[PDB]
Design a protein around this motif. Structure first.
Motif, mmCIF file in Angstrom:
data_model
loop_
_atom_site.group_PDB
_atom_site.id
_atom_site.type_symbol
_atom_site.label_atom_id
_atom_site.label_comp_id
_atom_site.label_asym_id
_atom_site.label_seq_id
_atom_site.Cartn_x
_atom_site.Cartn_y
_atom_site.Cartn_z
ATOM 1 N N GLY A 13 0.794 -1.210 0.000
ATOM 2 C CA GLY A 13 0.000 0.000 0.000
ATOM 3 C C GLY A 13 0.830 1.264 0.000
ATOM 4 N N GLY A 14 0.212 2.376 -0.386
ATOM 5 C CA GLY A 14 0.858 3.664 -0.302
ATOM 6 C C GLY A 14 0.831 4.206 1.111
ATOM 7 N N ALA A 15 1.325 5.431 1.251
ATOM 8 C CA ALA A 15 1.404 6.046 2.567
ATOM 9 C C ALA A 15 0.008 6.303 3.119
ATOM 10 C CB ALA A 15 2.192 7.351 2.489
ATOM 11 N N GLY A 16 -0.218 5.881 4.358
ATOM 12 C CA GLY A 16 -1.465 6.168 5.043
ATOM 13 C C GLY A 16 -2.695 5.509 4.457
ATOM 14 N N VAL A 17 -2.595 4.239 4.068
ATOM 15 C CA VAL A 17 -3.751 3.481 3.597
ATOM 16 C C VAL A 17 -4.201 2.422 4.589
ATOM 17 C CG1 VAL A 17 -3.256 3.896 1.168
ATOM 18 C CG2 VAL A 17 -2.306 1.872 2.297
ATOM 19 N N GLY A 18 -3.450 2.187 5.661
ATOM 20 C CA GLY A 18 -3.868 1.264 6.697
ATOM 21 C C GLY A 18 -2.964 0.061 6.863
ATOM 22 N N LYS A 19 -1.735 0.143 6.353
ATOM 23 C CA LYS A 19 -0.804 -0.970 6.504
ATOM 24 C C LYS A 19 -0.509 -1.237 7.974
ATOM 25 C CE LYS A 19 2.528 0.513 3.918
ATOM 26 N NZ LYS A 19 1.765 1.758 3.652
ATOM 27 N N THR A 20 -0.214 -0.183 8.737
ATOM 28 C CA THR A 20 0.135 -0.361 10.142
ATOM 29 C C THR A 20 -1.079 -0.775 10.963
ATOM 30 O OG1 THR A 20 2.035 1.130 10.109
ATOM 31 C CG2 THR A 20 0.896 0.837 12.209
ATOM 32 N N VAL A 21 -2.246 -0.205 10.663
ATOM 33 C CA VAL A 21 -3.458 -0.603 11.369
ATOM 34 C C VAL A 21 -3.744 -2.078 11.130
ATOM 35 C CG1 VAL A 21 -5.951 -0.288 11.469
ATOM 36 C CG2 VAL A 21 -4.444 1.703 11.426
ATOM 37 N N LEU A 22 -3.573 -2.536 9.890
ATOM 38 C CA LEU A 22 -3.789 -3.948 9.592
ATOM 39 C C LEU A 22 -2.726 -4.829 10.238
ATOM 40 C CD1 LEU A 22 -5.608 -5.928 8.240
ATOM 41 C CD2 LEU A 22 -4.515 -5.435 6.052
ATOM 42 N N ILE B 215 -13.686 2.939 2.622
ATOM 43 C CA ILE B 215 -13.809 1.499 2.819
ATOM 44 C C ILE B 215 -12.586 1.012 3.583
ATOM 45 C CG2 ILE B 215 -13.786 -0.731 1.664
ATOM 46 C CD1 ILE B 215 -16.465 0.360 1.418
ATOM 47 N N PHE B 216 -12.818 0.366 4.726
ATOM 48 C CA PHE B 216 -11.742 -0.098 5.587
ATOM 49 C C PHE B 216 -11.999 -1.544 6.000
ATOM 50 C CE2 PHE B 216 -11.165 4.497 6.204
ATOM 51 C CZ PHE B 216 -9.815 4.569 5.947
ATOM 52 N N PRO B 217 -10.999 -2.438 5.899
ATOM 53 C CA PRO B 217 -9.650 -2.165 5.391
ATOM 54 C C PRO B 217 -9.661 -1.855 3.901
ATOM 55 C CG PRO B 217 -9.938 -4.506 5.718
ATOM 56 C CD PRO B 217 -11.159 -3.849 6.286
ATOM 57 N N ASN C 78 -15.367 -3.449 10.551
ATOM 58 C CA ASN C 78 -14.880 -2.750 11.733
ATOM 59 C C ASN C 78 -13.833 -3.621 12.414
ATOM 60 O OD1 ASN C 78 -17.143 -4.483 12.174
ATOM 61 N ND2 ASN C 78 -17.273 -3.744 14.287
ATOM 62 N N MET C 79 -12.612 -3.111 12.510
ATOM 63 C CA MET C 79 -11.480 -3.872 13.008
ATOM 64 C C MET C 79 -11.222 -3.552 14.475
ATOM 65 S SD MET C 79 -9.281 -3.335 9.580
ATOM 66 C CE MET C 79 -7.633 -3.434 10.271
ATOM 67 N N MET C 80 -10.604 -4.506 15.172
ATOM 68 C CA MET C 80 -10.273 -4.290 16.577
ATOM 69 C C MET C 80 -9.310 -3.122 16.736
ATOM 70 S SD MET C 80 -12.096 -6.913 17.130
ATOM 71 C CE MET C 80 -12.293 -8.614 17.647
ATOM 72 N N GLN D 51 -9.803 3.042 17.849
ATOM 73 C CA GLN D 51 -9.197 4.326 18.179
ATOM 74 C C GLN D 51 -9.489 5.392 17.133
ATOM 75 O OE1 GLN D 51 -4.677 3.698 17.686
ATOM 76 N NE2 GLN D 51 -5.668 1.920 16.743
ATOM 77 N N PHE D 52 -9.839 4.993 15.911
ATOM 78 C CA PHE D 52 -10.113 5.942 14.844
ATOM 79 C C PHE D 52 -11.598 6.180 14.619
ATOM 80 C CE2 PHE D 52 -6.251 3.509 13.595
ATOM 81 C CZ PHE D 52 -5.339 4.493 13.908
ATOM 82 N N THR D 53 -12.457 5.237 15.012
ATOM 83 C CA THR D 53 -13.888 5.354 14.783
ATOM 84 C C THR D 53 -14.724 5.308 16.050
ATOM 85 O OG1 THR D 53 -14.128 2.960 14.455
ATOM 86 C CG2 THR D 53 -13.655 4.303 12.514
ATOM 87 N N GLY D 54 -14.189 4.790 17.154
ATOM 88 C CA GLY D 54 -14.960 4.604 18.362
ATOM 89 C C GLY D 54 -15.842 3.379 18.360
HETATM 90 N N1 ADP Z 1 -9.714 -0.029 9.606
HETATM 91 C C1 ADP Z 1 -9.665 1.320 9.692
HETATM 92 N N2 ADP Z 1 -10.722 2.041 10.120
HETATM 93 C C2 ADP Z 1 -10.685 3.383 10.209
HETATM 94 N N3 ADP Z 1 -9.603 4.108 9.882
HETATM 95 C C3 ADP Z 1 -8.471 3.516 9.437
HETATM 96 C C4 ADP Z 1 -8.441 2.055 9.316
HETATM 97 N N4 ADP Z 1 -7.224 1.727 8.859
HETATM 98 C C5 ADP Z 1 -6.527 2.876 8.698
HETATM 99 N N5 ADP Z 1 -7.272 3.938 9.039
HETATM 100 C C6 ADP Z 1 -6.802 5.339 8.988
HETATM 101 O O1 ADP Z 1 -5.734 5.444 8.041
HETATM 102 C C7 ADP Z 1 -4.531 5.866 8.690
HETATM 103 C C8 ADP Z 1 -3.300 5.170 8.113
HETATM 104 O O2 ADP Z 1 -3.080 3.930 8.780
HETATM 105 P P1 ADP Z 1 -1.603 3.341 9.004
HETATM 106 O O3 ADP Z 1 -1.595 1.877 8.653
HETATM 107 O O4 ADP Z 1 -1.134 3.788 10.364
HETATM 108 O O5 ADP Z 1 -0.704 4.100 7.910
HETATM 109 P P2 ADP Z 1 0.029 3.276 6.739
HETATM 110 O O6 ADP Z 1 -1.090 2.698 5.918
HETATM 111 O O7 ADP Z 1 0.849 4.321 6.031
HETATM 112 O O8 ADP Z 1 0.843 2.249 7.481
HETATM 113 C C9 ADP Z 1 -4.743 5.593 10.171
HETATM 114 O O9 ADP Z 1 -4.053 6.531 10.990
HETATM 115 C C10 ADP Z 1 -6.239 5.686 10.351
HETATM 116 O O10 ADP Z 1 -6.630 7.005 10.736
#
Ligand code: ADP
Ligand code: ATP
Ligand code: ADP
Ligand code: MG
Ligand code: MG
Lengths: 49, 48, 468, 464, 468
Positions: E153-162, E335-337, E408-410, E414-417
């Motif tokens: 993924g590119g920057a800030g698409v949810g790689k770290t969250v996943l 859409i997340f992820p 909705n992910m565990m 922190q991002f959606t409540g």
């Molecule tokens: N499943 C999710 N639900 C809601 N917001 C998300 C979700 N995944 C990512 N995000 C948003 O996208 C941002 C980028 O996620 P992160 O993985 O930290 O960056 P990167 O994708 O560059 O690693 C997060 O800070 C968050 O705000």
């Protein structure tokens, strides 16, 4: 430049000259070739600055 | 009849747009090749 | 103490000096070319200290005919140009030599063309509007008195015609001094400007400096500094409001790029010099208005290959108070001046400065034009017929607005024979408020084309048939 | 006086010669690889004078097995190819060696492959038409004598048959000869062409010169000049009309680019060699009419990314006088040659050159064919009956015209017993003028298939 | 028998040694910076033998304050990190120093971080599904236990969250050991992960190795090797299943490219080092499961500028058993992820492994989404009303399917409540079978957005005024 000099010789003697460059695109390409063969760093579309 | 005329016009406009976009895309492709070569050759010259 | 030429690479000369006699950076050295037709005295400007008592200098004249080993003499000072009231009404080159009267100004005070910008403590932001009479500029990109104005545009879009228009509108009825700097532009354009200023009796107030295209890059990158030196003398010594016109600053940047390539510096992106931003910053920061001393600077900026992303205009953008971007797309539609209303900007287009009514009308016009630009994609394929009723109304409004932003300019009379028009700012605001409201939607589009205020709109609409 | 290898970098070889014995630029030098597995004689071409008695050369063969310090012998002249009538019917490489009979032609007269074009005063100032005898080419896309014709067509469109037909027509009608230049030739395809020409019995009239794909860029660069030199001998010394085939010219340009890269030159726009235009001009200007004789060239052109503004096709088209596009759509209909009459074009289809009547007839044919192409979609989807009566009339006339552009080719005789036909230009013009007027619309469609002029049309009409 | 610094330029240091004392390639050398503010001990990894007894090395720490001619000591071995059960529950840097307990692990066994990959005859394909509970991943990109998994993924698409989500789902109930490698990523993220693992009680089973984006290029080059060395010890010596997490592996390549030009290597295409593929191959081939020894590796692969054709991700693609590709378009649609169901892939998504039902449902979902992607432009221009009835049905089904692939992910609370959810594989297959048949076509598409299984769908539909 050769054609322009030949025309300028007449122009500065009070004559009226019409010079046609057919065409300056190929002259630009030739100058780019010379510049590249001199290893001058190129710019837009590989042309010298 | 009006729909036929309008759709013919739309198809002609789409063809013209495709032509223009293809020309722009080819210009961009050539420019990208030229810029990549410029960067590569600049690096090589610097390490020369 | 005299040096000697060791390397000649185009307009760049390497000179070796005796130990302990190496000239300082930017010093003016003199060499001689003796070949018959090309005989002259080269003025070189020290650019680099190469080591081993070698200096790299940029020649202000072509080096054709120069020989290795010829004597080079150091003047001990950088290039200097005459300053004072006497420069007004006369044409000079980058070196300060008068062209219409050779030898003139030799006894004037001479100022070095290199100097520091005003200290930061002396800088004060300028927010005073400079009414022009052009509807588009007055409404969307109001110019700043004592501020910095730029006209960006590609080849043949109207930068020079707009510069002439602003000379007509601002410099003619000007109580201060005017300085024009032709930088790498057509020599015949310089001759035309000279003759036209003479005809309008504006020449006696104006000092002209020309570094036109058929010059070595050094001259093209130093002529702007020379003209700015004259302008700075007028600003700082005489307490005069000063008008500074530069056409074209991109030519200064391009000459810098050529010089950098000649100097052997590693190229930056797009082949530009690494010091592009530094050189532009120095020059532009010298072009400024200090506390209580006004310089209104107007610069034409060329955009290569219509690429507004190019490093030169991109770096120029940051130095300006008002930016008028001329668009080839607008030019193709016959709209003059070919201003891109969405791309152009002005720092003083905010309610606190231009008032709430002006700002609101400008924002509404911008919104309508932006919506039209967004709809362009659909309109290209299907036309306006598939749009919603709101969108159809907005598209008609936007077409009329874009046509009405055009104007018959004073400088355009030469190309069309139609005398130009001046529109007061209040009338502009009222007319565009009415147009955005929808009070002229019945009139035909062409009625809004190349006219002045609402009276002209009424006359043209009546001529075309519509009633107003 | 012999040199020695100093540096070896792939196909780039540096050679040091004694002080006063440096070879001229483009001279051919010989070196020996003595390793048993790869034993061979390398031919190096002097590309640069590096100074201090060093020269930089491009090896014509792979340098694997070459040793530093081996003796390098200067031949005293550039690459020279055998010339004369003896080269006809044989296959050569870029260096003049015969591939089908090693050693053959080693005693012929040898001409250097680097030659200047005809002197400016010796050039014909007036363009001329090359009457091929094919109705489609003669009417719609006339070929310029001493000109250049681009050829476009995929596989299975009749391109090889077209080349054989042109060989036949230049050998028979013009009493000339043909030189085929396979630039970047695939070895399989080169062998196939050799066997096909031998079977068709036109090999005797053709000289084949192959610079194969699996050879270093130098030979792929110089093969075109080799073939051009053979053709130039045929034109200037034998006073014969010559038809030169180049396939593919883009591969010549790409080999030039590769050589320029190997020599350390800085690439120009889109990575091509800085001297792209100069090289293309040097090659193409040698193909002209002079002293009453001419070399006509038909060159296959590859367009990268289908981008005609690309520097390679852009430079190539600055020299092309005509374009012949072969279309699988025409081929599937059985129309031979499968030339697309609408995509193909010629720069001399101008009343000032071909005459007013010719231009008028050609324009009428093109208009009818274009309208038929436009109505094709309606025919295909809505059905023929959906069209108006005038549309049906024009469809019938266009079908007859397009089938009449087919011809029974000489090269086709090897497939069908029927021989070929040569339609004089005036006969073609008058026949297509009559056809456009609708004076043969009543005849059956099949009557217009693979025939010559009006006499053949009548004969086949009576047969039906 | 010690060397001395000769040249310093950024992170690259040249060191001259006596005859016969040139350190072997990859050897670790030590140098002293004695300046009080920046006093430290530089660790330099020998990168090249330049000849004349000179060696070029990459500094593992910033070289600010380093002086020419200072003594350089050779340790005789490569960088080595502690190994053993003791590393679990602790945070280390690329050099093996314990950050959370300085001096800890100094007495452990130490393994060099440079190592050859497993022999080919020891390699064994892995074709066992690793259920995660995420609908999109479980259905379209099934992960492999003991296989190599990547999140592109590119920057800030949810790689770290996943990555955090997969730590929550897989590592929480993992019998074996976990190794996390923070490679050139944010220090704040490292601290957050450390605290989260401590609170979740997973830290005791996890070894964390951090080299952050603020570190010099050498540390970002070698931290992945250090973490992989710990994981390799766990795989080969302890003989237990290992979970390996790397975020972001692209930083290894980026640091290599950063130092490449200073090492004297001519740049390759797109500004990358010529050795990109070879270095990446070495590192990735070390990350693998051998016969009977399982490493399940999950890697976050940054795609520069969202360009999946970039040489780094393009070369990385060949090293993965399963790839989940995150798309900026999907992200911007909310859409997340943000998984791109058409670009992602898995080697075990075939009927033999996952079964006929799973494969058929996944293929039908992919086909519907591909057709919808094809029709998107037509819908944008001409609207949905101009599509055939079957295409309208497919468009509605595809919109519902694409919304239902979101979840909705565990780690997303922190991002959606909204608390996260988990869906069993059987429920996912059944739900998407029902969706592909149009059994939920009557429900609004919003009912399918960010939910879990079919019970969540029914509850949300009821809340929105519709009955499932
Ligand atoms: N499943 C999710 N639900 C809601 N917001 C998300 C979700 N995944 C990512 N995000 C948003 O996208 C941002 C980028 O996620 P992160 O993985 O930290 O960056 P990167 O994708 O560059 O690693 C997060 O800070 C968050 O705000
Ligand atoms: N307001 C106008 N009304 C009518 N014609 C105009 C107007 N402005 C420009 N033109 C036409 O466009 C031509 C180009 O204008 P101008 O010289 O001002 O452009 P430019 O941007 O300075 O060009 P260049 O890049 O060549 O210096 C003018 O000569 C005139 O033909
Ligand atoms: N005029 C013709 N008459 C009969 N057969 C033809 C004719 N033109 C082409 N063909 C057939 O079509 C095929 C075309 O193949 P070839 O001549 O190699 O051209 P290409 O390289 O375009 O396929 C040949 O095998 C040939 O049998
Ligand atoms: Mg201008
Ligand atoms: Mg991240």
């Amino acid at each position: 430049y050769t054609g322009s000099a030949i025309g300028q010789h007449w122009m500065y003697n009070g004559k009226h000259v019409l010079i046609v460059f057919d065409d300056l695109s190929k002259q630009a390409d030739a100058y780019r070739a010379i510049s590249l063969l001199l290893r001058r760093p190129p710019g837009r579309e590989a042309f010298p600055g | 009849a009006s729909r036929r005329r309008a759709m013919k016009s739309a198809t002609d406009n789409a063809d013209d747009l495709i032509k223009a976009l293809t020309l722009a895309a080819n210009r961009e492709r050539q420019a990208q090749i030229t810029q990549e070569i410029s960067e590569i050759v600049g690096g090589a010259n610097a390490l020369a | 103490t005299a040096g000697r030429v060791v390397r000649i690479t185009g307009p760049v000369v390497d000179v070796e000096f005796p130990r302990g006699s190496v000239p300082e950076l930017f010093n003016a050295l003199h060499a001689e070319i003796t070949f018959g037709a090309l005989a002259k005295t080269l003025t070189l400007e020290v650019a680099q200290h190469l080591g081993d008592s070698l200096v790299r200098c940029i020649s202000m004249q072509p080096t054709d005919g120069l020989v290795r080993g010829v004597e080079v003499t150091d003047t001990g000072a950088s290039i200097s140009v005459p300053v004072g009231d006497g420069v007004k009404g006369h044409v000079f080159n980058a070196l300060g030599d008068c062209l219409d009267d050779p030898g003139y100004g030799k006894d004037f005070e001479h100022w070095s063309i290199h100097r520091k910008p005003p200290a930061f403590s002396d800088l004060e932001p300028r927010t005073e509007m400079l009414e022009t009479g052009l509807k588009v500029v007055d409404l969307l990109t109001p110019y700043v008195r004592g501020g910095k104005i730029a006209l960006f545009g590609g080849a043949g879009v109207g930068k020079t015609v707009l510069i002439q228009e602003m000379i007509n509108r601002i410099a003619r009825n000007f109580g201060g001094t005017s300085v024009f700097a032709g930088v790498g532009e057509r020599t015949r354009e310089g001759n035309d400007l000279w003759v036209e200023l003479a005809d309008a009796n504006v020449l006696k107030d104006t000092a002209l400096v020309f570094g036109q295209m058929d010059e070595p890059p050094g001259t093209r990158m130093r002529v702007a500094l020379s003209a700015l030196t004259m302008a700075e003398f007028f600003r700082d010594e005489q307490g005069q409001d000063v008008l500074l016109f530069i056409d074209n600053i991109f030519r200064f940047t391009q000459a810098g790029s050529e010089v950098s390539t000649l100097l052997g510096r590693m190229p930056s992106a797009v082949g530009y010099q690494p010091t592009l931003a530094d050189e532009m910053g120095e020059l532009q920061e010298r072009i400024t208005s200090t506390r209580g001393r006004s310089i209104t600077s107007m610069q034409a900026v060329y955009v290569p290959a219509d690429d507004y992303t190019d490093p030169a205009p991109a770096t120029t953008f940051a130095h300006l108070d008002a930016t008028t971007e001329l668009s080839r797309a607008v030019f193709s539609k016959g709209i003059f001046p070919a201003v891109d209303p969405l791309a152009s900007s002005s720092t003083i287009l905010d309610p606190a400065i231009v008032g709430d009514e002006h700002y609101r009308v400008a924002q509404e016009v911008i919104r309508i034009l932006q919506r039209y630009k967004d709809l362009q994609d659909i309109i290209a394929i299907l036309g306006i017929d598939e749009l919603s009723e709101e969108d159809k109304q907005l598209v008609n409004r936007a077409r009329r607005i874009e046509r009405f932003l055009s104007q018959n300019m004073m400088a355009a009379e030469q190309f069309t024979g139609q005398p130009g028009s001046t529109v007061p700012l209040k009338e502009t605001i009222e007319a565009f408020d009415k147009l955005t409201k929808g009070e002229f939607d019945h009139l035909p589009e062409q009625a809004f084309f190349l006219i002045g205020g609402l009276d002209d709109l009424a006359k043209k609409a009546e001529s075309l048939g519509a009633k107003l």
